[PDB]
């Protein structure tokens, strides 16, 4: 795959900021994308986006949709390239 990449803490973690991530994997091992964001005091903060490794949760999910009820940080993962560019939850 390739996924959308975002790191909100890009400077301290010495990574890139925004763009694409090209996923490195293993032989026929599945690859996914993830989106992760906060909802602190009515403002939606983006946390990270990028490649997620073979995860039973993300299986055959086209839309990145978070499922946990009212978590601190929201997380979703999805299958298919760039699928993590858009994220929701419910």
């Amino acid at each position, epitope marked *: 795959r390739e996924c959308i990449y975002y790191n909100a803490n890009w400077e301290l973690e*010495r990574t890139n900021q925004s763009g694409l991530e090209r996923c*490195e994997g*293993e032989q026929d091992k599945r690859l996914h994308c993830y989106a992760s964001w906060r909802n602190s005091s009515g403002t939606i903060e983006l946390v990270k986006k990028g*490649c997620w490794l073979d*995860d*039973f*949760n993300c299986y055959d999910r086209q839309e990145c949709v978070a499922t946990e009820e009212n*978590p*601190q940080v929201y997380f979703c993962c999805c299958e298919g390239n760039f699928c993590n560019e858009r994220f929701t939850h419910l």
Partner: antibody
Amino acid sequence: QVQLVQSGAEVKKPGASVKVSCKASGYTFTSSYINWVRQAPGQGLEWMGTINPVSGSTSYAQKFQGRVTMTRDTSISTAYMELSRLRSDDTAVYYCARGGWFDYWGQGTLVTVSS
Amino acid sequence: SALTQPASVSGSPGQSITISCTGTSSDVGSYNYVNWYQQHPGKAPKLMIYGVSKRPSGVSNRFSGSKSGNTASLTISGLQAEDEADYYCGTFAGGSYYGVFGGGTKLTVLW
């Protein structure tokens, strides 16, 4: 390539606490979970909990619910496990493993909790 | 919900042995997320099969996995002396899913 290396061996006195480290190299640390599993000498594998290094979230084994603390410092790609209010039947080898399939295991950290 | 697998099994070199991992339809019956770890004494577990049946790179094709009903089964073909180890089954751990392991099986390969 993919490799998790753990903190050295710990000897503790009961009631105390221990915190073990897990240093992921060889892949993108925040690209999958870290899992923690311990093993009482001559015995099975026991699952303790999972940490999602991105979200920062944690799930815990009910057995350990409320005295084990799981964390990570993503800026050095290291996950931590802290077991507090130790005992005797806490004496084990402690493992971290990559991702929910546990597809790569650390080398283990022996924690001996003896008076 | 514990996974139960036999205490030990013995094999002769060249033979096939199969270790089984049984739970309820809540878990094993419901999800293709059983995995098999080999563990030589005093060393860390290694992943042999995951996702019921899938094999990582660098894992001998002699190792295969399957599942019928509420039991997943690891099968080691053409036994070798180096196949002698502890074998645990677990399930996927993370997300909606919480971890569990079997008691393990001690596979003895008598030469």
